[PDB]
Amino acid sequence: SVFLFPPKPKDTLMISRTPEVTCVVVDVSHEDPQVKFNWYVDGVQVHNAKTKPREQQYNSTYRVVSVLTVLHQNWLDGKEYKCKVSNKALPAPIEKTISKAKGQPREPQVYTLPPSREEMTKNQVSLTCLVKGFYPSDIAVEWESNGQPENNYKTTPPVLDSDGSFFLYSKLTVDKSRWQQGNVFSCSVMHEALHNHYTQKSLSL
Amino acid sequence: SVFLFPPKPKDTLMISRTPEVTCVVVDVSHEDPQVKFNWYVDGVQVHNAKTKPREQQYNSTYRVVSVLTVLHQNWLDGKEYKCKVSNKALPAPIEKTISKAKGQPREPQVYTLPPSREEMTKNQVSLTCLVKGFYPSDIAVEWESNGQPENNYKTTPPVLDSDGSFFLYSKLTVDKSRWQQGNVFSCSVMHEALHNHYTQKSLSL
Amino acid sequence: IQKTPQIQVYSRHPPENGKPNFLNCYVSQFHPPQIEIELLKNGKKIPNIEMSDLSFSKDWSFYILAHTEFTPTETDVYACRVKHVTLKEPKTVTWDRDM
Amino acid sequence: IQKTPQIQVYSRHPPENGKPNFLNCYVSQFHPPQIEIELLKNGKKIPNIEMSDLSFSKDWSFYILAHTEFTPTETDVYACRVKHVTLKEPKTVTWDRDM
């Protein structure tokens, strides 16, 4: 079975990053490991195009993955990333097409929510960012402290609202003291329908 | 394939409700539809025990479900609800055991969060309940207005926090006016590790 | 929590055809308390029967006694018909003379 | 966005054994700009070569020219070895006299 995953939105957005289209097949079998990956972009076959399958030996079977690296521009201009897996134990070339959305994007609403007073009775508090009314579900939220990365956050999966939009919450747990000292916190949201695929909203005491 | 689902926690909690253990098999086949459901509780076979399979005709195959009704007491005292599916196209009796948790429960933290000021620039606002640090994931949150049911809410799936706990958010969208008129709202959380399996926390202007 | 009723029919004194007696239907072990109960003679409802006060047991399930004066014969069939939610079709139970 | 280099070796004037000339390796189409480049004689590095200023094209990919004075013979092999991230093992390209 051949699954085909997109590049991470951050990684197609940022020229400093590198976008990859990952073709994950789980099976293939022994006696027939000879899965010829075929990578097409729009129409054209890319040979390698720096395609890189690295073999794994799992379960009772093999887990084989090839990673096609994408031009930021192409995916943003939505080309079709067609993965094809061959073999002989396999009567037909397993074909898989991805590209982005194609649209109609909805811009996320980023409001930052302070801890509750009842929670200042705890000596760790929680910082909340509500990101709502986006489309597609393809988003990326992160947190910062003062100006620098906070690793201490948990983001909920996008869940579909009554609207026909998606929403999420992201919860930064900081120290009660760290909040009370009027220290600046911030949630930094990345989605297609944002100003430069990027926005940021600040929580300060 | 035989899946076996629990009763809804609300329904095992409330004597006014009726708990059901649902055995959902998807396949069975034609020429061999003769799936003898077998229902055991702790050790003992329950015959029917008001077991009720109702036939569905799906996909290209059959979707067969039998619903064993449970005594509140028994499930709360954790008996084993063992579903078994027979047939002849099926070399072996497909066995499935459920019961509750067995433990170690963690009591949820229910804080209610007001709309942001930046959101009072909208003429619909959102009311948030953060429910955190529970275990197991088996919880049920609901909303009320003044004292009566609000149907206008969306709850996120329990997602596992850094803690080794679960958390969720639930978002009540009300009218800006409806909030500004100092009207009482409330989130009503139901989980095993709560005072009577039930708690409630209020949002008021 | 629902529970189907248990139904038991019997007589007061040792039965003897042609001799006046009392028929008893004891319906028990049920939940909820909303139930229909009739005494039948040859499958057709007998008019004007009596009933005791509705009560319940240590396990919470309900119980009650329907009864009336009757004279057993060799050909007449006596039963007790009961309707309750747990029952898709009503249940009819026939009187057994050795009980 | 990574791009592997294109490598092309050639000479200034029409080649003739035993006659002084200049060897040119033109490395282009690459990204990032961090790259290693050497001129080889019989598989071993030639000392003291020259290079032009590093530039780039309308599509952003980089380009540059390594060169030196040499006299072609019938037996001596000349190449251009290049190391870059996109390359797991370096690439060696041999000079083709008809170019």
Place this chain on the structure above:
Amino acid sequence: AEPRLPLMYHLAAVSDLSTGLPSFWATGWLGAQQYLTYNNLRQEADPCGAWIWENQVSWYWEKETTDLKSKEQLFLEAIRTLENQINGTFTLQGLLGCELAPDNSSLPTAVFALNGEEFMRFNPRTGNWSGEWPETDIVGNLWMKQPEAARKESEFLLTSCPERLLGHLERGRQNLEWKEPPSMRLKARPGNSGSSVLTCAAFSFYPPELKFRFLRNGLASGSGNCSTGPNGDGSFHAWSLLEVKRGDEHHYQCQVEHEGLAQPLTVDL
């Protein structure tokens, strides 16, 4: 006097009246005999059968009617509030009573259920209600909303109950110490492939305690699959079933024990 034999009350309320049930009703019991009945439609506590010849003080029945009218109120109200907060239909029940300690004081009982499951208790020596479910709060909180409720509940259980019980043992001695012995019959009928079933049946007795023993050739052989049920007039009826090999019937006898009998009673086919 039968010191301490239980006095117990059965109470219920329901939202669905499609089968003609009253909204609230109660029955009261002395051991196994029911001495009282009451429903919201008559609002009177009346004695059951034999209990009408008992010499009681002039105010006996007026006082039972009063306590019961109180309970009726607390129960019917609990249903409306539940109906307001949760969709559905409800059934509410209670079990309240006592038994005498040797020095003559009370050992009480007080428990409650909602839609078939126990959801609440009440300790009379502390005056508090307990539970573990969301509807416990809804109901318990509603009942606390007038402190006297709790106080009058502790008194019914720790004072009135034992005084009633103590007056019944005396004034109602003939009723409690009656032993109408059972009338017996033993018969045989066809069973499953190659088997027979014997049925020993006992008519019109009081008290309800009776022991069955089957005998094959004069020797104890088991007690059979037994059951009991009410008889419509104060006495009881019972029966036990035994499976035997076809042709084997005449070897069995039935024997019963009962407080109304001078010694066991052997019965013949």
Place this chain on the structure above:
Amino acid sequence: AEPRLPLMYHLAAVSDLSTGLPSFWATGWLGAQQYLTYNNLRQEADPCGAWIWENQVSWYWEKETTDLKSKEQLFLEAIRTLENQINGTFTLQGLLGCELAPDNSSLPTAVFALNGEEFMRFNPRTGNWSGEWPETDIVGNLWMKQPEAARKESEFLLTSCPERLLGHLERGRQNLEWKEPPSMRLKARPGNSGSSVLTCAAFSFYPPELKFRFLRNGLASGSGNCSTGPNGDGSFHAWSLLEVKRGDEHHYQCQVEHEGLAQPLTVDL
């Protein structure tokens, strides 16, 4: 004078210095010829090759060095800020220049890229920076933090560029109007199963525009698979490949067109 031929600047900065690269460096071009070089280690703008005999005003080179030192600053700073907010390593590039309109004014160019992709532009007639990605904000905001930056960028593009270009067409006429014609050679070698490959090669010419046409028996036959490359001294080198059937070689000729030639030049095997 060659009115308007482009004047263009190539700018870059990088965080990784493991291969001995300078932190910032630039090259400048007139059409296809490079007339200037500059890096942060020397901090001087020096002319390339032939451009050293050009009669210029006494202050020509001091002024180019000044503008370039400004850019160097804006670029090296953009990298440190990116390094602070995002893990990784970065590469930053820019393309800036102009071309003359018939009335002699400017038609400019200004674009930027980050890690291989275009992420920003700058319109000199408005003074604003644009983009569409999270790093556009980080960089654009950093550069706005001193209004003069924008003002000096609009002047380099709309005033200095056209005056430099206009002075070059005049003072550097011999350099721009040179047509060193190509030296030609045509050869054949083995191909894939049953085929042969002909290679037509052109040495030392200027300008870079040259046209190839192969001829079979005096008749146009295609232009082959062609390519060009720099020659190390100001002139260029090119070549075209054609696959023919083995034994078929002597039927082909190679013909080239070039501004340095009076009429096309036919070449023989």
